[PDB]
Amino acid sequence: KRKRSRKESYSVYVYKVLKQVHPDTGISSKAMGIMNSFVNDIFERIAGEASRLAHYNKRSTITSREIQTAVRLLLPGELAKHAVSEGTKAVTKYTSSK
Amino acid sequence: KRKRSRKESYSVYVYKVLKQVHPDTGISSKAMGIMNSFVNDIFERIAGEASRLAHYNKRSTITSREIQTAVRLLLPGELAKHAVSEGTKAVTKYTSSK
Amino acid sequence: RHRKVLRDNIQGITKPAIRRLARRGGVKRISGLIYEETRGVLKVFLENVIRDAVTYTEHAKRKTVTAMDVVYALKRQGRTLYGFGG
Amino acid sequence: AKRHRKVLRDNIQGITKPAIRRLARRGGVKRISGLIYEETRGVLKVFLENVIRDAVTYTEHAKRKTVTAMDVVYALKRQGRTLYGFGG
Amino acid sequence: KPHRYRPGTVALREIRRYQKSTELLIRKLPFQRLVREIAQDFKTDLRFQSSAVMALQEACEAYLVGLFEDTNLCAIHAKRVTIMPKDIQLARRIRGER
Amino acid sequence: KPHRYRPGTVALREIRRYQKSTELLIRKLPFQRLVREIAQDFKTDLRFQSSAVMALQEACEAYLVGLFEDTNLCAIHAKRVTIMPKDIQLARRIRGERA
Amino acid sequence: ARAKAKSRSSRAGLQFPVGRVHRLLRKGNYAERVGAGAPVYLAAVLEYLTAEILELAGNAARDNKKTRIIPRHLQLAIRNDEELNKLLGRVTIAQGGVLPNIQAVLLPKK
Amino acid sequence: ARAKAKSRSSRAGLQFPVGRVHRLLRKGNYAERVGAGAPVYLAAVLEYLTAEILELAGNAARDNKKTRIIPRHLQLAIRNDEELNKLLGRVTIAQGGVLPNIQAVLLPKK
DNA sequence: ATCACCCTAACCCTAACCCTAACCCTAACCCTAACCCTAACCCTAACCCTAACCCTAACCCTAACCCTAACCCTAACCCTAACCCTAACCCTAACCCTAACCCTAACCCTAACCCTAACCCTAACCCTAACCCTAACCCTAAGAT
DNA sequence: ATCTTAGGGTTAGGGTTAGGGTTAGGGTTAGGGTTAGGGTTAGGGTTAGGGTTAGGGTTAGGGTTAGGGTTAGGGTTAGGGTTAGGGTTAGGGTTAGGGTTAGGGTTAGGGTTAGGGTTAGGGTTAGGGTTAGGGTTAGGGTGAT
């Protein structure tokens, strides 16, 4: 009955993305830890800004519009442009599948 | 039927405290605006830190202990000491009157 | 309805104004090349703040930039401002 | 029976002159004055104290006697120095 | 012959004068034109509240005054009394701006 | 005479060597003792994980290296190549640490 | 049937509003639940900080021979106290000005 | 009697988990409600940034003639890219080192 | 090393004006009381992770010595910024006018929440072999003379 | 051109860890039911932008000049490079015990809802604190002795 709680991470998805961008390259454990930290940091930044945006304008819901505005506020120029493009494409594809 | 929404402020309470500390002293409109900004800023800081503390320890409630720890984190030495003393005193007095 | 395009307004920040701002910062003697450098610095700062203010304004589906938009933009730049409805 | 502790004295001198030289070399410093070392130690001490204080605060809030890596990570994050590679 | 102050006397007098007051040191209308010119690049046919332009001016002047204090320190560090563009550049570099 | 490098040659060599590498530059045991000593006044009888001490060491070394880069810039501003305590103090004042 | 109401501010011996603070905590998306003593503690701390600043600002106003407090007095109070200056290091007070300070090297030599 | 389950990540054509991001948004006390398209957008953005950094780090790793990515390669990738350097300007990477920069005035005259 | 002379900021008195503080009404928000349910406390047990200790061997630190080059101080100069004055121009302030715009109210509907079953994905665990590190050797470019 | 040295390139071999493969349990997804947050339309106040006039305070440009920044030279001391001796840290190992964490059982504290009473916000108004203007005066700067 004494079983430790499980701990989730982004290792699987980071490895998938790595195998897309560089088919031959591998990654060390420490570098994977760095990538998990990075993903958590960015998630928190974007989610916090979206929360503040919703509160300022007296809305109860976080929608993709708040996410887009937060992305535009937090990322520098070309990064923001490309990230917005990727987000809009993903949402459009998701909605197109009913 | 078309009336503007009310605006809340801490002006009443700031004036009460001012009359406690300096009975023969007034305050201008701009100074009061600044005091409002200060109170809102400090509220946001303490409440955010308390929320993060509750999240780290897997607790669903913000209690006086979270507020105390947040105060100790956010304020310098003597400010933190005296603020903690005031908070504990107030909570004790509140509990005493059923 | 008609709106007119503005240009080269950075020269409106005159040499005396820059000298006054330096005086408040406790500067005694000023080189002649400071003024152009200062204009560039102010330009960069203002662009950064105004872009965020306009982002906040557009998110709300408004056309008028309010003081709260500026306050939020400054706050997220790391420069909190008191006295404008914070 | 019970495992008692012992006190520690004068460990700031453990940060030696060669170590400070190496730290300056990674910072691109070519020539170093003799009075730097003392200065450096002071600076370091201040930094450490602040971080450690915050960390201990976190540790006390959870009612633990052991300072973990996450306590340090949170303490550093709330001072504007985010650290990757130890969790979070 | 007519009275004439030595170089630096009037500068010290000006320092004492402007550190004693609180008014804005930049003309309001030129700053407003500058703000509108800058903003027209991001979006066309924008409107501004008066308080928005005033807040911008307050922030800008505070920023420049702080920068000049740091620049003065950098100039004094180099055994000088005159501030030069390299002093501003150094101050901004260390601040993390450039 | 036996071979002798001129002043600054070994300094440049060391700069290159230590900018190429990534290991820690402070000895682990003395740093751990310093950490425990500093912590002993905030609370008595504390325990530390190994990773906590390693995190502290990483953060401290990164901080010091950054400060040394800024100090080097301040020293070069005054037409010197030798860093002095006044350079550290100027860098810390401008950074906002007020020292 | 019902007892006469007492404000929660009066029970804690405070001037700041415990009820309003409690509501702002519940509606701020800070946590799922809010304890009974959290708003009391927070209101007490806010009142303390307000009183500190106001005392210093009143002294500043009296030094300039004024009855009212203006933003300049708040600025002087904040920047002349080490702990309040540290707490508000990244804050700009509108129409606050700066402290009078001239570097000793800039003063006339003789 | 029910259609075979398809992951929302495959519906959006992503590698990052839309469901997990949705849960993290719901549990993180960010708002009362979360829209259906928020987790998709956020997952897409996170994936793009991850791919961004990983491509640059893989290039750096190949430059030093190595097969795995270590934290040094991540550090080099971040500090050699202007926008990634700006985004992660206040971040320390463990075992990363620094960029090899020496001031021009320090180099020998001849 | 005072001293005459002269400019500037500060101090004081008076009219006046506009901004603050007091008052009144009222709608909204806080307090009280009854009810319910789940987060948090508590006590036990279980494993496990840190502190304490011994050994040892190589490697890093410390101190002394020799020397050079970087730093600091002085004098000369020359050019650049401060100070002052005048002509003119552009900001400031007060006023109007209107169209754009922001806010509210009523309406309603669809997107988000809630619960349940079941099934697919991800974390924990095992095991192997391939990338990385170590040791010995040789070239190779750069430093000092 | 010449000797010398230190980092880098090559090869053979060990070994650590990253990557692939199982298994299970729990977290995501589909399906159905409910409700209130937000989107839509109309209307109305309000406020920001554009135009006008007048004047007077501020800016720009030119002339005079001193003193501060720049440069070259000379001395000196302090920091760099080197070497031998010895302290001390890094690594390996073991032990035990105090500390962290899960698991089952309670309970009371916090959320919900409705009704009613208090209080804080909005709007109006008088008067006094602050400000503008005019007149001394006290402090401090500047050239001369």
Author numbering:
A (entry chain H), B (entry chain D): 25 to 122
C (entry chain F): 17 to 102
D (entry chain B): 15 to 102
E (entry chain E): 37 to 134
F (entry chain A): 37 to 135
G (entry chain C), H (entry chain G): 10 to 119
The authors write:
Mammalian telomeric DNA, composed of tandem telomeric TTAGGG repeats, is specifically bound by the shelterin complex. Mammalian telomeres, like bulk genomic DNA, are also packaged into nucleosomes. Among these subunits, TRF1 and TRF2 each bind double-stranded (ds) telomeric DNA as preformed homodimers and thus associate shelterin with ds telomeric repeats. Here, we determined the cryo–electron microscopy (cryo-EM) structures of an unbound human telomeric nucleosome core particle (teloNCP) and TRF1-bound teloNCP.
The telomeric TTAGGG repeats were suggested to be unfavorable for DNA positioning on the nucleosome. (A) Cryo-EM reconstruction (2.5 Å) and (B) the atomic model of a human teloNCP. Within the DNA duplex, the G-strand consists of the G-rich TTAGGG repeats. The C-strand consists of the CCCTAA repeats, which are complementary to the TTAGGG repeats. The observed nucleosome positioning creates an asymmetry in the DNA lengths on either side of the dyad. For clarity, we name the two ends of the nucleosomal DNA as short (S) and long (L) according to their lengths. Third, we resolved additional amino acids at the N termini of all four histone proteins. The newly resolved extensions of the histones have a role in determining the binding site preference of the shelterin factor TRF1 on the teloNCP.
